[PDB]
Design a protein around this ligand. Structure first.
Ligand SMILES: N[C@@H](CC(=O)N1CCn2c(nnc2C(F)(F)F)C1)Cc1cc(F)c(F)cc1F
Ligand SMILES: N[C@@H](CC(=O)N1CCn2c(nnc2C(F)(F)F)C1)Cc1cc(F)c(F)cc1F
Lengths: 715, 715
């Protein structure tokens, strides 16, 4: 019966027990994980779940200068560990860290804990270090150049590129927009030979600069800025501006000759990935055109420079970013996820580019390709075949027989062993916070490592609202999925205020059979009905449902949020005059769109870190859905929150971080002044030195307290 | 009985009729004024108030390319008019304008309207043009250099200085901080000879730069910034940073030789003014030290460069800026306002520097010295001898007899004729919006030009709260003046919420017997008791009362605002739990100080454009009261709103303009983050591209609507 406390939510007091840093060892029988302390790396058996041994310990390693470590990686051989310390984030995926090599060699007592640890580099902190296939070399990036460490040669460090320059030329790591929008941090590969390095070189010299102020602030304090403010500058192309010029280069480890691949790509095209195949003489180069609807897979010869078109996959809309990391190479074959038939499905290709078979078919979506077992010819993947709200692990055999491997319905995230014999399963649903099991490739639970019983017990003493799923029919006959969360004291006799939550961005889903206690859960415990509906444009229901928004985003999503409010307003326990809506990022943009759709259904709303005109956002994301402002002028105008701002109805709170390198604070500053000149009253909360995550010290608690009080006062 | 409408207040619908651009002509019998149209300049008699003639008309002037004009100036002779068009503000006092010379020569019909108008310069817009004593030359500034126009030589334009450079060297106009804090826009003078030009040269090259973003915005839209924002940069030294290096230079009109005056000034001193005397060979140079408590008046020879100390005036606190423009030169004598005896009083000096007499004495303050009539030896000035709430015009004869010239008690602002024979009087009090009379130097009303009867009649239909003055005693026995404004329906039976308004800055006063209808008046008509009290630190009551705050500003002012709230809270018609406070500029800073003084008396407050730590503010103002941060570390800490922020009590709204070149938006951004990390909830309203005035298009209406709703919701 006690009441949830927001501070418990924001401080993560109900964060379920989990396992971090799980890496399948090459042997195929074992996995390693990080200790909770962050001070040990411990080996375990997939088959039994038994602790085999502690392989690494900060208090039991020689010349180890760090107290805790952040992350780690095994050499492909299994004899060395690359360990990262002092991890310093740059953008969402990039960071520097001081890395260390730890050899896994047994001593006189047969233990791997008393070895000596070698600083990976006597120079400065490193980016994206990667082992060569034999484990004898590590390539890394620092100051936008590539460096090579030869472990057989005294950790011999050589400099591969000399033209790296800040805000000008990047070697082996992507620029801001590629990193954010193709979702990756490394373009740096070794050949199966161990003889060649391949990398993408980004020339962003003629990409526009963007700069915003930095104040001293607090948590952290930037002390040089105590009296006079400073600034942050970086390359960021807005919609329709020029992107980096990119090319693929190779470096011959024994020769030291650098070569450029002769890739026939459009001047304004992209190279979202490179990947060495299992063939030593074949480097996969993935390329898109600027409209992002033609994916061309090339095989480049790292020595001759010759590039051969292997596959062309085309769309009347666009190719999604998630395809690229589902391309896995094997001696004679490779996988490909494609939406050609209207659903995300798995295709199996020969290494000549020749379609062997369509592995999955049906009106469901494959989410991830987990791997192929050559022993039986069988494919492992996750999908939502059960329902768009769920994900389960599946196996399809060589003849086409499908078996679902998950024991329980909800959200199943598997991490397979090297051999596909075993997998670790992390599971949740609305009622299960986390349950971690070890399973074999038939689905049998070999061991239950974590059940989160202690969490359930602690929770037992609190009065927890419960989510329930529901569907309803829009006025044009579309089924929408949503969840509804009612106070634990709910009465059909009483009428209640409503808080709608949504994200609503292309391909996204927030209606998922998974567990959480969030700020929404807290709102529900304060007496609100909290509802979340995934409108048109969201993922999991195939291409037509997702991409009906193409060239004019936000409009259809906004009507479906208005339709959701009308439907709630008809319910006898809902006070239609007290309906609020909020969201963050695309969700904040959708709050503005929805509150100014024309039907005055919302009393109040909060838009956090909201884009307000798509011309302020970046090239790769915006153009994927909208093309450029010059090709799609009317679409940009119609998708803009500015155009419909005179119909804004309800009390609005705009929240933004002033150091947002993702949705620039420009969005909020320009939109607010439009609102001022229209005579619309609204409220603001701007956060000094905060980015798109708005976090730091007491910031999140402060922010959710502000949102709580805003809806308490306006609903 | 109708209700005031805020939109009428912000659109200036009750702005009293007045007269603009009143200039006393040299003859001493006449004044000129601008038409309301802005299209005519019309001559009138002081003696009779009769219209003599229209001297200038846009529709009746030849080769006149403008529809309206902004301002105008007469040649010292009376034969030419310098007229300004296209006035473009830069800071509070500086602007560029395209000027035109119009000769006042009669035609065949005897009229001055059909003449030809000459563009003052074929080059670009000009700054601070000034006539030579004979009227044959005009000096002006453009692009930080001095130019000379010789009207007897075909409007011959020559360039006096060649080293002017933006953000580097200014000739003849002050930098940002001198302009704002010594209150002037021109350091450019001709000798009585008409033979020499003198000017101050500002070298701000080593003053720090400050930059803030500019967005496109609206009203005005900055169209180049529609996609990518820009910035504004200028020189602005914060407290304790270096000021411009300054010197006085002269240019020999016939010789073209430039010379530097040998002024013995401290390295870090100021030259707040230069002024040519009635002696052709004597240039007054006014200088302060950096502590601003030693005013040294020098007489410089423009040819020999030799400078002679004429007067030293010293203070244990500081010399106020208002003294400099009260120094008026005569053939054998000059005036000086000084606070040496503890009150602002008028002193009469010989031109050798030798005190002839103390003209005024008593425990009241002289506000302005209006002039000296040599015929009777008599002095004209304004003072508050009646009460700190009032100002009247006074005359003191050669033998010491004093006569008060004003007919009515309240606020009397006089503009004397060249000869001191007549003056124009603008008058108001709590009940008189504006009454404009013409009076002779005994006080007799010769004519009443304006009575604002129409305004009174329009007002008659509205229900107007009325101000009344009051005093009360603080707990340490100090008498404070305040005004109280109650709703027109006031009842002693009812209990009411309170809105306190204050400015509270050193030497300022808001409790004045003068007329206005403001946002406060609107709040009163919505059912609030609105109170304003001038606490310790404010002006008009002598040096001890004003400067008891020296070296630790804000603390004492804040206690007196808390004492005002306690006193109001004891009244039976005041609900002590519903007391709010607000202010703008220093008044916004005082809102924070007062709301975090420690006694939790305020329910809510609004701080507009508030300084929050004095180290963020500029050198001349801050140091006048606080010296530098390095000399007064503990004083800066104790005056800071940051230090006491943990005691903030009540709901706060912070309002700021993001392009504030005066109180940088840094103040608000740094303070808000301090509040976030302390866990204090507050509200914000930031205004894109707005300066310290926060105005533009619908901005003011939007802003006062926001303040109204904030107190309505929190009180
Ligand atoms: N910038 C966008 C990034 C994104 O949408 N994807 C990149 C990463 N990704 C995606 N799909 N899978 C992956 C990942 F697995 F690589 F991470 C799509 C997200 C995003 C959308 C907005 F409208 C906005 F205002 C801010 C914002 F940060
Ligand atoms: N910057 C200050 C200027 C001033 O106080 N004087 C300059 C002009 N002046 C004065 N006294 N007479 C005159 C004038 F007649 F010259 F105008 C004093 C005003 C001021 C005080 C603050 F705390 C602040 F946060 C902003 C701000 F703009």
């Amino acid at each position: 019966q006690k009441a949830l406390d927001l501070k418990d939510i924001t401080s993560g007091r109900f964060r379920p027990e989990n396992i971090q840093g799980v890496i399948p060892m090459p042997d195929g029988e074992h996995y390693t994980q990080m200790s909770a302390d962050g001070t040990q790396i411990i080996k375990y058996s997939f088959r039994t779940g038994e602790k085999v041994e502690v392989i690494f310990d900060v208090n039991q390693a020689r010349e180890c200068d760090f107290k805790n470590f952040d992350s780690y990686q095994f050499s492909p051989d299994g004899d060395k560990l690359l360990i990262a310390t002092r991890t310093t984030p740059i953008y969402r995926h990039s960071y520097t860290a001081v890395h260390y090599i730890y050899p896994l060699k047994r001593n006189d007592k047969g233990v791997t804990t008393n070895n000596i640890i070698e600083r990976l580099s006597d120079g400065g902190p490193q980016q994206v270090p990667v082992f060569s296939p034999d484990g004898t070399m590590i390539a890394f990036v620092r100051d936008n150049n590539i460096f090579l460490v030869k472990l057989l040669y005294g950790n011999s460090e050589s400099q591969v590129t000399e033209d790296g320059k800040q805000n000008s030329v990047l070697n082996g790591i992507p620029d801001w927009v590629y990193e954010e929008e193709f979702g990756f941090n490394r373009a740096l590969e070794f050949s199966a030979d161990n003889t060649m390095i391949a990398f993408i070189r980004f020339d962003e010299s003629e990409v526009p600069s963007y700069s915003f102020p930095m104040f001293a602030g607090e948590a952290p304090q930037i002390t040089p800025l105590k009296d006079y403010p400073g600034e942050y500058t970086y390359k960021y192309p807005k919609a329709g501006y020029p992107n980096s010029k990119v090319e693929v280069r190779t470096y011959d480890i024994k020769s030291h000759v650098t070569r450029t691949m002769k890739l026939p790509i459009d001047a304004d095209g992209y190279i979202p990935r490179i990947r060495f195949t299992k063939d030593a003489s074949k480097l996969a180069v993935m390329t898109l055109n600027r409209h992002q609807d033609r994916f061309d897979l090339y095989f480049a010869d790292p020595r001759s420079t010759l590039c051969k078109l292997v596959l062309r996959d085309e769309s009347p809309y666009y190719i999604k970013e998630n395809v690229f990391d589902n391309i896995k190479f094997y001696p004679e074959t490779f996988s490909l996820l494609s939406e050609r038939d209207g659903f995300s499905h798995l295709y199996w290709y020969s290494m000549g580019g020749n379609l062997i078979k369509k592995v999955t078919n049906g009106k469901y979506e494959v989410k991830d390709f987990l791997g192929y077992d050559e022993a039986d010819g069988s494919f492992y993947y996750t999908s939502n075949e059960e329902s768009p709200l769920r994900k389960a692990v599946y196996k399809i055999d060589k003849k086409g027989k499908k078996l679902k491997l998950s024991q329980r319905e909800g959200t199943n995230t598997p991490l397979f062993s090297q051999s596909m014999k075993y997998y670790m399963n992390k599971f949740s649903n609305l009622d299960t916070p986390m349950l971690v099991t070890l399973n074999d490739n038939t689905g049998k639970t070999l061991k239950t490592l974590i059940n989160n019983d202690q969490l359930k017990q602690t929770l037992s003493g609190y009065a927890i609202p419960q989510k329930e799923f529901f569907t309803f029919q829009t006025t044009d006959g579309v089924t929408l999925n949503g969840w509804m969360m009612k106070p634990a004291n709910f009465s059909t006799s009483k009428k209640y205020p409503v808080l709608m939550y949504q994200y609503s961005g292309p391909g996204s889903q927030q209606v998922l059979d998974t567990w959480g206690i969030s700020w929404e859960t807290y709102m529900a415990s304060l007496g609100y009905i909290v509802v979340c509906v995934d409108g048109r444009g969201t993922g999991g229901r195939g291409e037509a449902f997702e991409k009906c928004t193409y060239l004019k985003i936000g409009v259809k999503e906004a009507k479906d949020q208005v339709e959701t409010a009308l439907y709630l307003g008809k319910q006898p326990y809902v006070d239609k005059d007290r309906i609020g809506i909020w969201g963050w990022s695309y969700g904040g943009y959708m709050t503005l769109m929805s509150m100014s759709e024309g039907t005055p259904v919302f009393k109040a709303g909060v838009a956090v870190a909201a884009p307000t005109d798509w011309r302020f956002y970046d090239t790769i994301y915006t153009e994927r859905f909208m093309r450029t402002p010059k090709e799609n002028a009317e679409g940009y105008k119609e998708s803009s929150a500015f155009t419909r701002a005179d119909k804004l109805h309800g009390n609005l709170l705009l929240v933004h971080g002033m150091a947002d390198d993702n949705v620039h604070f420009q969005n909020c500053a320009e939109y607010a002044e439009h609102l001022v000149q229209l005579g619309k009253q609204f409220d603001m909360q701007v956060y000094t030195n905060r980015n798109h995550g708005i976090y730091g010290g007491n910031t999140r608690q402060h922010l959710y307290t502000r949102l709580t009080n805003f809806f308490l006062n306006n609903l």
